[PDB]
Design a protein around this ligand. Structure first.
Ligand code: NA
Ligand code: NA
Ligand code: NA
Ligand code: NA
Lengths: 512, 511
């Protein structure tokens, strides 16, 4: 009669309880650190439990910080839009054109035709293609783009069910994990790397280490090993290894194999000859990638030397916008008889869909919360309280931080997790007198390792929404993939990250 | 077969032509302020003739300014989100619940039964109500609170025009949009706290001239209300003529009652007011009460409770505080109850119905205005006004008013006056005629931003309703701006000089 109503209004009562129980913290401490800690705790509680929508919670700092007097609303509003958002707009413009003109379908079908219908090699081909695509596009868009095609290919291979369901589960999980793994290789690949680069360059403006080439040259060896080991782990866990049928060349002819291959060939033929919209989209994709790579990598100043009087004004977001806004200008189809006009090959109505406005607001809210934590002085207090932790061995601190971030990223979004630890792990670095990158790189790499739960990151939810995967089947694979990723990151940090970044000494661009 | 190809691909060719033909401007002319002028000209050309979508054009400053070296891309990006965007998020959270539970339909159908089936007087009633509301709350807030109600009224009248048995509806919708957008005359000019432009002018005047205590409530109203009422009436007549026919006969009936019966039938079809609609209406009233009671000027508001962090909490804070309650207040319930409840609005229902077009458009306008400040293009234009001491008394007034009302069409009203006011005050002190005589017309004409909806936030909330034709807005804005400038000049010439003594040099101004 009374307890029944409590379990129905769980979210409302939990939000009210969270707001009221943490109230004694700023009510009687009369410090800005306490008020910002109250705001941080409320935002973290609502992001972890998802009592409110993530983007609604991200708007709380713009409501609490101005009222607590920590920083004016004009200053909070200026932190909701950064170069991350411009890059996201420019890349969503490209992704909308790829999705609209079925270029991804052509690439996926050609990859399936070239690799074959062997379930051991088909999964590797899908993972490689999805990881390469996620190297440039966002993980969420890559997962939402490849998966509808992977399922379509798999269900037509099965038709041409003790083995079908496990095959579709394996295909779901391989795409979900490969999007994330491929997003690690580049700064622009995922939102976590973009947020980390923005925070690192704002907090340490005297460091010129993080560019495209330097990030790639250490994130590719780790990501390739992680991808190969995850493919092996998934193949063993779901289907198992049959080496004789796998390593054999095209010599044993089976009727049901060409029966499956003919369906894929007929689908690719029904796709039709390549249209010029697909060619233009592919050319613009290649140009965007080449301009991202051509901005100074370290050995040759590609086109940053062209603007070598305003350093740092034109960035990768400028390249993304320049390429993406061309998708609003290049004509695609006509309609003269009626309207005497053309179509711009991407309409703004089509761009407004598929554009992650919620992710933009979430990242802006995280950046505003970090700015409030820096302005109020909470970051300095946290760094001072973690000063005695500097007597421990260095590697243990990085291991513990990476494990904590990895554990907390399985239930909270990657952009939220990375924004709640950079203002904590960054001040902690100089409280030990150790290179901040030596802690930040493993932490930002382990923030992306979100494979256990569907709520961990949008790539997991997109794949889980198809209903093929159970929670336990996903957790079993995510545990192994996450262990592989953490082991590879820690091996790289101890082996090949320290020569190029010189992590064993204290840098000259860090505060003393 | 060539002329047809040129005519069909006219937008692409025009974009390329206008990018390439203004290209001599940055390469020549010292390459310092001509780059931002080139960017401004290209963006304005794309805005006037919609060769590209307005939100795509607004993203051009994020490209052109960083590449020209005017300002870094990090600084340009931060300009696409300000307090206008927080206020817009809050008011759209309110409006999503207003339109989801059909509260706008109840209000529209009650107003149609009560006042104004005739569109001619309905437009006047809408303009008068919006202009009275804008005297107290804000211009942006007022253009956002009443616009859904006006759209609902027009849509209900269009539906009821079936008479139980499409050109006029579209022009009526355009007229109702522009009348709400342009109703900044009585509200926003007659009170210091009506708009931020008058607040900035008052704070600058009381600081630079602390011996002059003439500017306050009442004295501002006494000289501004006569001008604002004439501007409102003339703008109503101009809009009625521009969008509707010249109606003269019947204003000195089966069709009216044929629609009144349909309105009555559609009002009783709604039924009793629901819980969700009551909650939405209560939050609507609370948001307006908190906007009004922040700092009314004639009595301390709740901003006095925060008299340690002045200006940290704005109207955007109120909008967020009220709008974020729509995501947690229960609306419906999902042995009878299955597992939980649902909120008034969800994020899926908010992401749609959100003018993401207007957010980017206003952000691009803000970025272009900031780029015009980083590179001293706006400072150059303002400094082209100072060497005009030869003009005896009034040509300076006219030139300054025209320059400010032309530059306010691309920059925000606060930023437009913040530039010219410290330029006009020294010019008015170099001459010996009453710096108020110089500053009042320019302050009034700064708010006359009726062209280019990118400038005035009231012009963008209205523009966010699907009537995306800038030229239909340009035609009306030109006439409204001309009327406003003429009425301001008439007021300066006739009725403002007695109460401020504008024909003699005062004692509170430096000699
Ligand atoms: Na990616
Ligand atoms: Na995560
Ligand atoms: Na106003
Ligand atoms: Na303006």
């Amino acid at each position: 009669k009374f307890f029944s109503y409590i379990l129905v209004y769980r979210r409302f009562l939990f939000v009210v309880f969270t707001v009221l129980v943490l109230l004694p913290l700023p009510i009687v401490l009369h410090t800005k650190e306490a008020e910002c800690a109250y705001t941080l705790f409320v935002v973290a509680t609502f992001w972890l439990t998802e009592a409110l929508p993530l983007s609604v919670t991200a708007l709380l700092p713009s409501l609490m910080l101005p009222m607590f007097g920590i920083m004016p609303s004009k200053k909070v509003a200026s932190a909701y839009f950064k170069d991350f958002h411009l890059l996201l707009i420019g890349v969503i413009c490209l992704a909308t054109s790829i999705e609209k003109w079925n270029l991804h379908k052509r690439i996926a079908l050609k990859m399936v035709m070239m690799v074959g219908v062997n379930p051991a090699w088909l999964t590797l081909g899908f993972m490689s293609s999805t990881a390469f695509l996620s190297m440039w596009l966002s993980n969420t868009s890559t997962a939402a783009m490849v998966m509808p095609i992977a399922e379509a290919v798999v269900q037509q291979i099965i038709n041409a069910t003790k083995k079908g369901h496990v095959t579709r589960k394996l295909t779901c999980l391989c795409i979900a994990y490969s999007s994330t793994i491929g997003g690690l290789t580049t700064i622009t690949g995922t939102s976590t790397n973009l947020i980390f680069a923005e925070y690192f360059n704002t907090r340490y403006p005297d460091c010129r280490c993080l560019n495209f080439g330097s990030w790639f040259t250490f994130s590719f060896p780790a990501a390739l090993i992680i991808l190969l080991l995850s493919w092996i782990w998934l193949q063993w866990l779901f289907l198992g290894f049959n080496f004789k049928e796998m390593f054999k060349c095209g010599k044993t002819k089976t009727v049901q194999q060409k029966a499956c291959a003919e369906v894929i060939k007929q689908e690719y033929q029904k796709l039709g000859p390549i249209r010029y919209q697909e060619i233009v989209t592919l050319v613009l994709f290649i140009i965007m990638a080449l301009l991202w790579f051509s901005r100074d990598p370290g050995f040759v100043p590609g086109w940053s030397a062209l603007f070598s009087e305003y350093p740092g004004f034109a960035t990768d977001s400028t390249v993304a916008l320049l390429i993406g806004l061309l998708f609003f200008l290049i004509p695609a189809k006509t309609l003269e008889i009626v309207a005497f006009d053309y179509s711009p090959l991407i309409t703004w109505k089509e761009f407004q869909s598929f554009m992650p406005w919620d992710i933009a607001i979430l990242v802006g809210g995280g950046f505003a919360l970090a700015d409030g934590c820096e302005e109020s002085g909470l970051s300095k207090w946290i760094g001072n309280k973690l000063s005695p932790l500097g007597s421990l061995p260095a590697w243990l601190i990085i291991l513990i931080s990476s494990l904590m971030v990895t554990s907390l990223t399985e239930v909270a979004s990657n952009p939220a997790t990375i924004t709640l630890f950079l203002p904590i792990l960054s001040p902690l670095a100089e409280a030990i007198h150790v290179n901040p990158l030596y802690i930040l790189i493993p932490s930002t790499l382990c923030t992306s390792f979100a494979f256990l739960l569907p709520v961990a990151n949008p790539p997991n939810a997109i794949v889980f929404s198809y209903g093929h995967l159970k929670v336990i089947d996903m957790v079993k694979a995510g545990l192994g993939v996450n262990i592989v990723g953490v082991a590879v990151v820690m091996l790289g940090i101890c082996t090949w990250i320290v020569p190029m970044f010189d992590l064993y000494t204290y840098p000259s661009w860090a505060p003393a």
